[PDB]
C-alpha cells in the first residue's frame, strides 16, 4: 500500500506522532518518504543478516524478529511481518519505542541526512490538518 503524503500525515497524527518528543509532524512524513517512499510493503536486506521492514524500515536485528537474522534483539517485541501491514499502528508503536528522546530520530539515517535542517513542514502544508 503506497500512501499519499496527506493520508500518511493524517494517520500519523491520529497515532500521536505530532510533536512526539519535540518532533514536528513533518519529520515523520519526510522520514517515510526517504525510507520506503510511502510503501507499507517496502523491505531492504543489508550487508549483514538484517532486513529493514515497512513504511519506517524497522531493522530485524534490533527491533522486530524476522526469524532469519543472526542476533535478533526484538526490542519492539514484534515479528517483522506485522510491520508490513497497510495499517501503520504497529510500525508507529515500535518507532515511538525507538525514539526515547529528542534526538532519537537519528535512528533513521535518511532523516538525519535528508530531512534534518530542511523545511520538513513543507510535506504537510495544505493537508487537511
Amino acid at each position, epitope marked *: 500500500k503506497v500512501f499519499g503524503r496527506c493520508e500518511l500525515a493524517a494517520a500519523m497524527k491520529r497515532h500521536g506522532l505530532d*510533536n512526539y518528543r*519535540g*518532533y*514536528s509532524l513533518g*519529520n515523520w512524513v519526510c522520514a517515510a518518504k526517504f525510507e520506503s517512499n510511502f510503501n507499507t510493503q517496502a523491505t531492504n536486506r543489508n550487508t549483514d543478516g538484517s532486513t529493514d521492514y515497512g513504511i519506517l524500515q524497522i531493522n530485524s536485528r534490533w527491533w522486530c524478529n524476522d526469524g532469519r537474522t543472526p542476533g535478533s534483539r526484538n526490542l519492539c517485541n514484534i515479528p517483522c511481518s506485522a510491520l508490513l501491514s497497510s495499517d501503520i499502528t504497529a510500525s508507529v508503536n515500535c518507532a515511538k519505542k525507538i525514539v526515547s528522546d529528542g534526538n532519537g530520530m537519528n535512528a533513521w539515517v535518511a532523516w538525519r541526512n535528508r530531512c*534534518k*535542517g*530542511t*523545511d520538513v*513542514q513543507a510535506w504537510i*502544508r495544505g493537508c487537511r*490538518l
Partner: antibody
Amino acid sequence: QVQLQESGPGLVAPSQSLSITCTVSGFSLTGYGVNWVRQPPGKGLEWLGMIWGDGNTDYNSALKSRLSISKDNSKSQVFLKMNSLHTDDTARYYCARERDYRLDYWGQGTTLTVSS
Amino acid sequence: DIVLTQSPASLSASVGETVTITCRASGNIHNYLAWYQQKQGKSPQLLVYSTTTLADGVPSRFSGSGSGTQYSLKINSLQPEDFGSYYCQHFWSTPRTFGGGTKLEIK
C-alpha cells in the same frame, strides 16, 4: 556548547552596504537553520530572514530586495548583507539557531547605527 | 503575511499573581507558535514552542495553550525573575513574524 556570536561594523552611513557575521559553534550549519532578527532601540523583535540547513533562504517580504543571507559551512559562519541603509535600520541584530520550528539559541546581538 | 496581534502592551502585576498574554494570528498557523522572554538588555530566550511545549529548564508555572488563531501564555504565581518582555512568533510557512510584545512589570 552551542553558541552564536555576531560581529558587525557598529556605525555605517547610507553610503554603504552592511555586512554582519554570525560565527557559530557546537553544531553544524547543514543540520540546522539560522534566522536573523533585529530590534530597533526600545522596540519589538523584527524577523529579517533565514537560511535553512540545505542552503535555501527566505526573507521578510518588505526587506527582501535589500537583503542577502549566505553561509560558509566550513568556517561555521552565516552572513547577513544589507543594502540601501536607512536610518530606520539602526537596531540590535541577532542571529539565532532554528531547530525544528523554534529558535532555541541566540547570540548576544550586535548594535548597528545608520548615519548620514 | 500572517500578522500576530499581541495583547496587552503592558501588564503591572505582583509576585504571586497569575497573568495571561495573548496572540491572535491573522490566519491559521496550526500550532506552530513559540513564546520568548527577554530581560533587561538580554537576548530573547525560548520558553514554549509548538503552543504547549516548555523548553528545557523552563519552570512549570508557565503554560501555553491555543489552537487555530488564538494563542495564550499563562504564568501562574509570577516570581520576581518573570518580569520582562514577552513575544510570540509564528512558524507557519514564511515569512515568520513576531507579536508586538508585552511588558510585564512589577505592581
